[PDB]
Specification:
Chain D: It comes from Homo sapiens. Chain D: This is 26S proteasome non-ATPase regulatory subunit 1. Chain D: Belongs to the proteasome subunit S1 family. This is part of a larger assembly, with chains A, B, C, D, E and F. Chain B has one domain. Chain B is an all-alpha fold. Chain B is built from 10 helices and no strands. Helix content of chain C is 86%, strand content 0%. Chain C is rod-shaped, with a radius of gyration of 13 Å. The termini of chain C are far apart. In chain E, 94% of the residues lie in helices and 0% in strands. Chain E starts with a helix and ends with a helix. Classes of the chains: A mainly alpha, B mainly alpha, C mainly alpha, D mainly alpha, E mainly alpha, F mainly alpha. Chains in contact: A-B, A-C, A-D, A-F, B-D, C-D, C-E, D-E. At the A-B interface, helix 18, helix 20 and helix 21 of A face helix 5, helix 7 and helix 10 of B.
């Protein structure tokens, strides 16, 4: 009795998921597909968390005239892997429910992925996914029907793409799957579009990693439209790599804003080893800017376990002791290397001096050159003058250095009173928020 | 087989004509096979391994003659051989130093984003060893610090690291970005930084860099009477321009209705 | 495919009827 | 290193570069995009060893991009090579996109009744007619008529009515279905008259099938001519129905004129 | 008849867009 | 829609920022700072 009960609830959930998708697909267009398919996908994720009986339920899913209730009785009668994957099509063709057949093909793959064999059997699941992909290829290319499969089964193809990524993660990588995704991008170029292409492209960047940054640059050129970001999590995924691309490309200032936007869009728990990686990129890039971000604002516990290094490193950046920074680099070099942001830490070792100058610029309106030398422990006043030229850098108040008695005049912007001097400054800020009044137009359109 | 290309290795290239003959024979190698159309036929790729060695020495000849467009083609081709999956490819002593030479070359063409891309390109080489790779990475730390302050240290860091032609290019790529500052009479001497362009307090050699095109780069006001810099400033007359901006934004808020 | 996939593009334009229903409700 | 191959000025290398670009267009879309200006010069250069192949790789620069018009420009450079890829996954869509460019250009030419119609690209027209021939090979009347009125050319339409030569539904009331969805009467009348002529070409011209010319064309002489043939063959039974059908289906006017033609 | 169906679906969109303009115009008249 | 993917790559807080600021400092414990003024 205890082992059958999980099977009964899962089978009932799958039957409800199939019935809802099929009924909507039959009536209307656009509302026909993906109206509850995303809900069905989260229900499928719950089914993945909740666990062979599922393959027997899959067997002979459809024959001709609808007999799904009779089929459910037949699944109970079986109670009372590779062959099972192809068994329903072999036993009897559905004779209808083409969007359902792709969903039916997807249902056995999830248990095969759940098994996580990391073996040829998992590759056989990939072969079953390829057969499902062929049905997806013909959904509009050969079938002249509406894109119910493109609207819904493309998400199923995206899950299959992630399973394909799992097989490649077990091995090395498949650029050919990305090329197949490029063919899907041509399908996206057609009447209907999907943003799954960017996520696989992010994996392509990841595979090249340090060895090639061209793929990231190619990604920047590849960037197109898809501002719908219906997944939203997908937009965060695009943002996380896009921010990574800028951070490696030395555009740290743009990257931190992108990472913050990416950090905000995390509806999924991302409890362990997940959101922490997104947090890690934001903190390092802000440290690279030289502004010091304390970890107290967020401090996720899993972020904390990986943050024992960075937290000491943040203390090291505040401290003037290079040896403390060296101890942190040697002791905590591991894990940061796993993150892949270790190269950013290597550039950060030089950046420690910049943090002090930024503190000086906020603290002192007109600091003495010799005083700057004492504050940053410059060996000589001329070295401090050289540092002052570096201090002007970009995005800081004009030094306007006299080069004589004035020394580091570092004059701050004046008349910054949100008055005439900032009249553009405090009106432009309103324009952006007032521009967000678009939400009233967008939601009004939905009814 | 394919001699002369590997035949002149002992006599590298005292004559530039020998490099031209080598290019023609390399073109004949291209006639025999493309650089790497596919990863199939690894034996043909083994022939390409011999080609990599001749290209690596050929790139050194390009630096010896200070070629730029031909060197760019050869450097891209050498990178493509590294691009080739060729797992069979053996470790090459020429390859490690030349990738470091390429890193220095990126500084010479001022491709700063690429220079970090190259530091990324060999993470295992950078680790701690590969002293040839280390000199440009140390130079990169100096470059963000301002190559001018440590340029004397960088010049004397290695008398010969196979970068002898490349260090001459490094002297050529001496940074003059410090030019946007007061100088001549107002500052009079910038030799304290130690960059070659502003090096020397007042002699004709310093004057040649200092008074090149009248003043260093030569655009903008003369440094001696320069007002610190361009000194463009800003005005509140823009309110009329802002009024024009106001027409566009305000009309749109009404346009939405 | 030229005259069998272009008709599919007109199916994309069918969503405008849903907007027409929303505006029809406003008219009432 | 596709750019590096272009940098050396060797004609054999020019062929090597286009072949290498064809091999991995997807892997390095940006590299072709960076060198697209160089590629465009080579594609339009007669001196280039394979300008047609350079045009084929130029379409590959636009493989990621969606510009059909650029592909039509590439078809001009490719010449036969664009036609040579009669069926090729992605290119098949791009040639179809060129067919869409061709139909809109042809519809614009049909719109002009004063002549001076802009010439269709011969290479673009060649891919369109070749795909149109594939539709005739398929034997589907619908596929054959698929570019028949898109080109707005009666000569292509005669080939489409011929199709695989079965001509069963087309040689009957296919005109009525076309007339219902037809947008322009001026182009429609040419289609209507030619289709009734093909019906006349059949050994028996159905009076219902030729009725559309009798009423929609409303040519009094043409109805008199068919009526005269009925009198000549003395087929009074067939003649009786068409005359009554004409009176019910259409108004007098031309009907009165055929009565005048019949009386004298 | 895919070529004919493409024309038929195109006609349906053209008619709907033509009608869509009327509803907005009358609705604006109602507001006055 | 769990991302996963990246596993491969007050009571005890709030004051942490304040504590971090002078964790290296405060060796004087304030009383020495007063003694330093006395020497001054």
């Amino acid at each position: 009795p205890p082992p059958p009960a999980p099977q009964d609830v899962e089978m009932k959930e799958e039957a409800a998921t199939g019935g809802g998708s099929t009924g909507e697909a039959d009536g209307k267009t656009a509302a026909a597909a993906a109206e509850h398919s995303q809900r069905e996908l989260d229900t499928v994720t719950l089914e993945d968390i909740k666990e062979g009986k599922e393959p027997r339920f899959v067997l002979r899913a459809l024959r001709m005239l609808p007999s799904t209730s009779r089929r459910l009785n037949h699944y109970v009668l079986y109670k009372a892997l590779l062959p099972f994957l192809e068994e329903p099509m072999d036993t009897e063709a559905d004779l209808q429910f083409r969007p359902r057949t792709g969903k039916a093909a997807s249902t056995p793959l999830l248990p095969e992925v759940e098994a996580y064999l990391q073996l040829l059997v998992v590759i056989f699941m990939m072969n079953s996914k390829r057969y499902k992909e062929a049905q997806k290829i013909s959904d509009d290319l050969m079938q002249k029907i509406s894109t119910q499969n493109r609207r819904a089964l493309d998400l199923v193809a995206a899950k299959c793409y992630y399973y394909h990524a799992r097989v490649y993660e077990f091995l090395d990588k498949l650029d050919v799957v990305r090329s197949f995704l490029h063919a899907r991008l041509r399908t996206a170029t057609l009447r209907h579009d999907a943003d799954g292409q960017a996520t696989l492209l992010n994996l392509l960047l990841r595979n090249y990693l340090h060895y090639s940054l061209y793929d990231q640059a190619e990604k920047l050129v590849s960037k197109s439209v898809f501002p719908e970001q219906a997944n939203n999590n997908e937009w965060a995924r695009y943002l996380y790599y896009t921010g990574r691309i800028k951070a490696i490309q030395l555009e740290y200032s743009e990257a931190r804003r992108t990472m913050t936007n990416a950090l905000r869009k995390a509806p999924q728990h991302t409890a362990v080893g997940f959101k922490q990686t997104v947090h890690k990129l934001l903190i390092v890039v802000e440290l690279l800017l030289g502004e010091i971000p304390d970890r107290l604002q967020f401090r996720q516990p899993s972020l904390k376990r990986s943050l024992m290094p960075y937290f000491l490193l943040t203390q090291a950046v505040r401290t003037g002791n290079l040896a403390k920074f060296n101890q942190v680099l040697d002791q905590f070099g591991e894990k940061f290397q796993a993150d892949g942001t270790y190269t950013l830490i290597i550039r950060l070792r030089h950046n420690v001096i910049k943090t002090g100058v930024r503190m000086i610029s906020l603290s002192y309106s007109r600091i003495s050159l010799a005083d700057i030398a004492q504050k940053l422990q410059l060996d000589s006043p001329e070295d401090a003058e050289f540092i002052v030229a570096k201090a002007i850098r970009d995005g800081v108040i004009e030094a306007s250095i006299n080069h004589e008695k004035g020394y580091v005049q570092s004059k701050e912007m004046i008349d910054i009173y949100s008055t005439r001097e900032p009249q553009l400054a405090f009106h432009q800020r309103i324009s952006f928020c007032l521009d967000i009044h678009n939400m009233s137009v967008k939601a009004m359109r939905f009814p | 087989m394919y001699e002369q290309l590997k035949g002149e290795w002992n006599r590298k290239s005292p004559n530039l004509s020998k490099c031209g003959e080598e290019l023609g024979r390399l073109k004949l190698v291209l006639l025999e096979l493309n650089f790497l159309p596919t990863t199939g036929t690894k034996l043909t790729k083994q022939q390409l391994i011999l080609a990599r060695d001749i290209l690596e020495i050929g790139a050194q000849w390009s630096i010896l003659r200070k070629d730029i467009p031909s060197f760019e083609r050869y450097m891209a081709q050498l990178k493509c051989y590294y691009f080739d999956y060729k797992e069979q490819l053996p470790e090459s002593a020429y390859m490690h130093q030349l990738l470091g030479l390429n890193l220095l070359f990126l500084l010479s063409q001022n491709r700063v984003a690429e220079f970090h891309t190259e530091l990324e390109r060999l993470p295992a080489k950078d680790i701690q060893t590969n002293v040839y790779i280390k000199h440009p990475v140390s130079l990169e730390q100096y470059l963000m610090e301002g190559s001018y302050n440590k340029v004397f240290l960088a010049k004397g860091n290695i008398p010969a690291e196979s970068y002898t032609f490349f260090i001459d290019i490094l002297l050529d790529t001496i940074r003059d970005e410090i030019a946007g500052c007061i100088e001549k009479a107002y500052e009079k001497i910038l030799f304290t930084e130690a960059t070659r362009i502003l090096f020397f307090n007042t002699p004709k050699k310093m004057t040649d860099y200092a008074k090149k095109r009248g003043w260093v780069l030569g655009p903008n006001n003369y440094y001696s009477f320069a007002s610190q810099q361009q000194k463009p400033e800003d005005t509140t007359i823009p309110s009329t321009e802002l009024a024009k901006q106001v027409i566009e934004y305000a009309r749109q808020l009404e346009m939405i209705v | 495919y030229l005259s069998k996939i272009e008709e599919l593009q007109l199916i994309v334009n069918d969503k405008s009827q849903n907007l027409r229903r929303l505006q029809a409700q406003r008219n009432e | 290193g596709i750019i590096s191959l272009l940098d050396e000025d060797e004609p054999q290398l020019k062929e090597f570069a286009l072949h290498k670009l064809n091999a991995v267009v997807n892997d390095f879309w940006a590299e072709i995009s960076e060198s697209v200006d160089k590629i465009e010069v080579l594609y339009e250069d007669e001196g280039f060893r394979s300008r047609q192949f350079a045009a084929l790789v130029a379409s590959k620069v636009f493989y990621h991009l969606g510009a059909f018009e650029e592909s039509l420009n590439y078809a001009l450079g490719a010449g036969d090579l664009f036609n040579v890829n009669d069926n090729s996954e992605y290119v098949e869509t791009i040639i179809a996109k060129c067919i869409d460019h061709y139909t809109k250009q042809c519809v614009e030419n049909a719109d002009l009744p004063e002549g001076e119609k802009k010439p269709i690209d011969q290479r673009l027209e060649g891919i369109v007619n070749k795909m149109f021939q594939r539709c005739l090979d398929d034997h589907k009347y619908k596929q054959a008529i698929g570019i028949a009125l898109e080109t707005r050319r009666l000569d292509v339409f005669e080939k489409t009515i011929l199709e695989s030569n079965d001509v069963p539904g087309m040689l009957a009331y296919s005109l009525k279905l076309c007339m219902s969805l037809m947008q322009n009467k001026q182009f429609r009348n040419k289609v209507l008259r030619v289709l009734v002529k093909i019906y006349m070409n059949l050994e028996k011209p159905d009076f219902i099938n030729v009725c559309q010319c009798l009423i929609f064309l409303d040519d009094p002489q043409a109805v008199s001519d068919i009526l005269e043939k009925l009198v000549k063959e003395d087929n009074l039974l067939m003649a009786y129905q068409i005359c009554f059908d004409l009176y019910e289906s259409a108004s007098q006017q031309f009907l009165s004129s055929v009565i005048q033609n019949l009386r004298t | 008849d895919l070529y004919s169906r493409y024309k038929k679906l195109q006609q349906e969109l053209e008619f709907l867009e033509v009608q869509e303009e009327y509803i907005k115009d009358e609705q604006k008249n109602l507001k006055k | 829609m769990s991302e996963k993917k990246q596993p491969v790559d007050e009571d005890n807080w709030d004051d942490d920022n304040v504590e971090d600021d002078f964790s290296n400092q405060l060796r004087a414990e304030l009383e020495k700072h007063g003694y330093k003024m006395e020497t001054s």
